[PDB]
Design an enzyme around this catalytic site. Sequence first.
Site, PDB file in Angstrom:
ATOM      1  N   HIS A 249       0.803  -1.226   0.000  1.00 39.80           N
ATOM      2  CA  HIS A 249       0.000   0.000   0.000  1.00 39.80           C
ATOM      3  C   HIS A 249       0.847   1.292   0.000  1.00 39.80           C
ATOM      4  O   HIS A 249       0.370   2.349  -0.424  1.00 39.80           O
ATOM      5  CB  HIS A 249      -1.057  -0.005   1.111  1.00 39.80           C
ATOM      6  CG  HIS A 249      -0.542   0.336   2.468  1.00 39.80           C
ATOM      7  ND1 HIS A 249      -0.393  -0.636   3.461  1.00 39.80           N
ATOM      8  CD2 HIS A 249      -0.220   1.548   2.984  1.00 39.80           C
ATOM      9  CE1 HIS A 249       0.042   0.009   4.526  1.00 39.80           C
ATOM     10  NE2 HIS A 249       0.179   1.332   4.277  1.00 39.80           N
TER      11      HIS A 249
ATOM     12  N   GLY B  21       1.755   6.097   9.848  1.00 43.19           N
ATOM     13  CA  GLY B  21       3.133   6.423   9.510  1.00 43.19           C
ATOM     14  C   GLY B  21       4.143   5.308   9.716  1.00 43.19           C
ATOM     15  O   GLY B  21       5.291   5.436   9.299  1.00 43.19           O
TER      16      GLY B  21
HETATM   17  C1  WIZ Z   1      -3.619  -1.672   3.489  1.00 43.33           C
HETATM   18  C2  WIZ Z   1      -4.041  -0.204   3.462  1.00 43.33           C
HETATM   19  N1  WIZ Z   1      -3.299   0.546   4.479  1.00 43.33           N
HETATM   20  C3  WIZ Z   1      -3.267   1.885   4.518  1.00 43.33           C
HETATM   21  O1  WIZ Z   1      -3.883   2.587   3.727  1.00 43.33           O
HETATM   22  C4  WIZ Z   1      -2.414   2.507   5.599  1.00 43.33           C
HETATM   23  C5  WIZ Z   1      -2.914   2.144   6.976  1.00 43.33           C
HETATM   24  O2  WIZ Z   1      -4.091   1.855   7.176  1.00 43.33           O
HETATM   25  N2  WIZ Z   1      -1.967   2.127   7.930  1.00 43.33           N
HETATM   26  C6  WIZ Z   1      -2.142   1.805   9.286  1.00 43.33           C
HETATM   27  C7  WIZ Z   1      -1.176   1.046   9.930  1.00 43.33           C
HETATM   28  C8  WIZ Z   1      -1.386   0.609  11.222  1.00 43.33           C
HETATM   29  C9  WIZ Z   1      -2.563   0.924  11.901  1.00 43.33           C
HETATM   30  C10 WIZ Z   1      -2.818   0.394  13.252  1.00 43.33           C
HETATM   31  N3  WIZ Z   1      -2.020  -0.575  13.695  1.00 43.33           N
HETATM   32  N4  WIZ Z   1      -3.785   0.859  13.959  1.00 43.33           N
HETATM   33  C11 WIZ Z   1      -3.507   1.719  11.264  1.00 43.33           C
HETATM   34  C12 WIZ Z   1      -3.302   2.155   9.968  1.00 43.33           C
HETATM   35  C13 WIZ Z   1      -5.541  -0.058   3.606  1.00 43.33           C
HETATM   36  C14 WIZ Z   1      -6.344  -0.098   2.476  1.00 43.33           C
HETATM   37  C15 WIZ Z   1      -7.723  -0.071   2.575  1.00 43.33           C
HETATM   38  C16 WIZ Z   1      -8.324  -0.003   3.820  1.00 43.33           C
HETATM   39  O3  WIZ Z   1      -9.699  -0.049   3.971  1.00 43.33           O
HETATM   40  C17 WIZ Z   1     -10.452  -0.736   3.020  1.00 43.33           C
HETATM   41  C18 WIZ Z   1     -11.420  -0.036   2.317  1.00 43.33           C
HETATM   42  C19 WIZ Z   1     -12.207  -0.711   1.399  1.00 43.33           C
HETATM   43  C20 WIZ Z   1     -12.030  -2.068   1.185  1.00 43.33           C
HETATM   44  C21 WIZ Z   1     -11.055  -2.767   1.885  1.00 43.33           C
HETATM   45  C22 WIZ Z   1     -10.858  -4.222   1.635  1.00 43.33           C
HETATM   46  O4  WIZ Z   1      -9.721  -4.710   2.041  1.00 43.33           O
HETATM   47  O5  WIZ Z   1     -11.721  -4.898   1.073  1.00 43.33           O
HETATM   48  C23 WIZ Z   1     -10.260  -2.091   2.807  1.00 43.33           C
HETATM   49  C24 WIZ Z   1      -7.524   0.063   4.952  1.00 43.33           C
HETATM   50 BR1  WIZ Z   1      -8.332   0.183   6.663  1.00 43.33          BR
HETATM   51  C25 WIZ Z   1      -6.145   0.039   4.854  1.00 43.33           C
END
Ligand code: WIZ
Lengths: 254, 141, 197
Positions: free
Chosen positions: A41, A190
């Site tokens: 990502h 981040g």
């Molecule tokens: C993989 C990508 N990641 C990012 O963008 C960065 C990110 O979220 N970084 C982060 C790191 C650690 C923590 C933590 N440990 N709390 C939080 C955030 C990501 C891509 C789509 C996301 O939602 C969907 C929306 C629609 C469909 C789908 C689907 O998969 O069908 C998934 C999510 Br939620 C995350």
Amino acid sequence: IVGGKVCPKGECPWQVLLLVNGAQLCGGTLINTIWVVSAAHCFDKIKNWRNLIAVLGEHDLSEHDGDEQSRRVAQVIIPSTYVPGTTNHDIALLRLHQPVVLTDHVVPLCLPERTFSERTLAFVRFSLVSGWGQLLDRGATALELMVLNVPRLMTQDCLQQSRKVGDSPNITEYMFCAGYSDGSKDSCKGDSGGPHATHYRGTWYLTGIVSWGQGCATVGHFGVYTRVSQYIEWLQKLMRSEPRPGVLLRAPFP
Amino acid sequence: AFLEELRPGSLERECKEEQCSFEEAREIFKDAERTKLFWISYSDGDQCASSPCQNGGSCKDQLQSYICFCLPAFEGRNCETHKDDQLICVNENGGCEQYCSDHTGTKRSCRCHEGYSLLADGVSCTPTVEYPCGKIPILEK
Amino acid sequence: TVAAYNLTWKSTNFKTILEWEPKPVNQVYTVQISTKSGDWKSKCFYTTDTECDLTDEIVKDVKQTYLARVFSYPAGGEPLYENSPEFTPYLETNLGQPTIQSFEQVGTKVNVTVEDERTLVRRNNTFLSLRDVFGKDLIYTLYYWKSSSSGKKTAKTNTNEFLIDVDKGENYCFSVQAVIPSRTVNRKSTDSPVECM
Ligand SMILES: C[C@H](NC(=O)CC(=O)Nc1ccc(C(=N)N)cc1)c1ccc(Oc2cccc(C(=O)O)c2)c(Br)c1
Ligand SMILES: *[C@H]1O[C@H](CO)[C@@H](O)[C@H](O)[C@H]1O
Ligand SMILES: *[C@@H]1O[C@@H](C)[C@@H](O)[C@@H](O)[C@@H]1O
Ligand SMILES: [Ca+2]
Ligand SMILES: [Ca+2]
Ligand SMILES: [Ca+2]
Ligand SMILES: [Ca+2]
Ligand SMILES: [Cl-]
Ligand SMILES: [Cl-]
Ligand SMILES: [Mg+2]
């Protein structure tokens, strides 16, 4: 990282800082002198593929010292199955144009064999997560490398202990949960691409990649990490591959 | 033998040496509570009579059950599990420091990640390079 | 596969066995156990039994709180499993049945000695007694009475011995119980077999 500590300089020697056009992009993990593992990502919005840099030996982003080493990223390999904008198969294998030099401040993290990671490392309770990400959900990022100890959960437990969120992403066999659901400690946006490193009988191993979650240290939610054990054979074969003209390679998975 | 019934009531002769019924014991203790105190253990029987503890273990009777005290190389309800027959990779990595390989028909073997080699003890790994993976040099590796 | 259910802890004097249902059909089990912050330890590898002796793991620290889980594996990525209730051996293990070791008349008084109750806790080559493990937390209670009594008398001790007053020319009977007064549930052992003068 929310609720962690400053990683003392040299104590997280496999942490990678990835830059694009000289700006902080994501974390990564060095696994030998040429190869870095990060999250797919991190590369969803890249246009300038020739402007990617990996920095090893980094600690304090406000000061340069003689322990930092920079290398151009020559190749970014992502599973063909990965879909930009989604969570599944969130892994990228990066080839450095020239090897880094191993020093007291720059050392790779062991990429483990699959069976050892599945039957032994998966049952070590705590592992470390690290990065220069947000110190609070939607807050400022860190100047000094942060680190946090998080406990791992089996997915059935993670689902049973998490607060339901309508239409939330599925936690697949290519992911695992780790952290705390009390709002105190977690990795954050981040820190994406950074290591989830597990200590076992005197050696540290790569078991996860910081990938996603619901906010950061949100009550009722755990951090979700890419399950590296599922990609060992995929990474090993690709590390033996010949370089290609373009930077991005969407390689078949499995 | 009716001539033995001429002897006065005795817990030893009626219940200890021979098996007594609840009523016979009740005539000795008289109180219902005191007879229950005697009856709960004496009627329960000895589950250790079948010698359930294997491999040199020791049996201790309990109410409707028993406990086995095993010798150090054994475990299980009946000391049936041999600890020496559990050297497999799912059991604490087969005792290997790094990698473990099961070998059916023979014993498991231990292996090491690249940059390490196996020591003469057959389980431990030592670095073969100055900066092996997964070691923190500033903490004296 | 089907998940295990009705996971129950069976424990007396720290001999601790986890039991579950159902009897397996084309499936085998493996049990894991941990403390809240420790690593998971595997036991009873690929068993077809519906029980697992966890004594050797809980006796490492009887005061810790343990959680176990039973994994179901097909005979032919994460498996199905079920968590057990939490188990704290020091607070929950059943106290074993005691034995009166001896009784002696010392004139107008009787000393009654309780045999040291053996437990599964080891301290280098030897099994610790219930008093070694519990210390001040353990008391023994004595029920005693003469043939013509209008009920029974009770005595209590912080050691394994009682010293009671008796009537001259009266034969007494005795029975003892192990008790952990600070407990609210599972406070007492079953009664020892009765011994009479
Ligand atoms: C993989 C990508 N990641 C990012 O963008 C960065 C990110 O979220 N970084 C982060 C790191 C650690 C923590 C933590 N440990 N709390 C939080 C955030 C990501 C891509 C789509 C996301 O939602 C969907 C929306 C629609 C469909 C789908 C689907 O998969 O069908 C998934 C999510 Br939620 C995350
Ligand atoms: C003795 O006999 C068997 C073992 O052979 C056991 O199942 C019983 O509980 C015990 O009394
Ligand atoms: C009872 O305890 C076990 C452990 C062995 O020492 C036996 O010999 C003994 O009778
Ligand atoms: Ca710096
Ligand atoms: Ca006799
Ligand atoms: Ca009668
Ligand atoms: Ca019995
Ligand atoms: Cl370069
Ligand atoms: Cl005792
Ligand atoms: Mg009779």
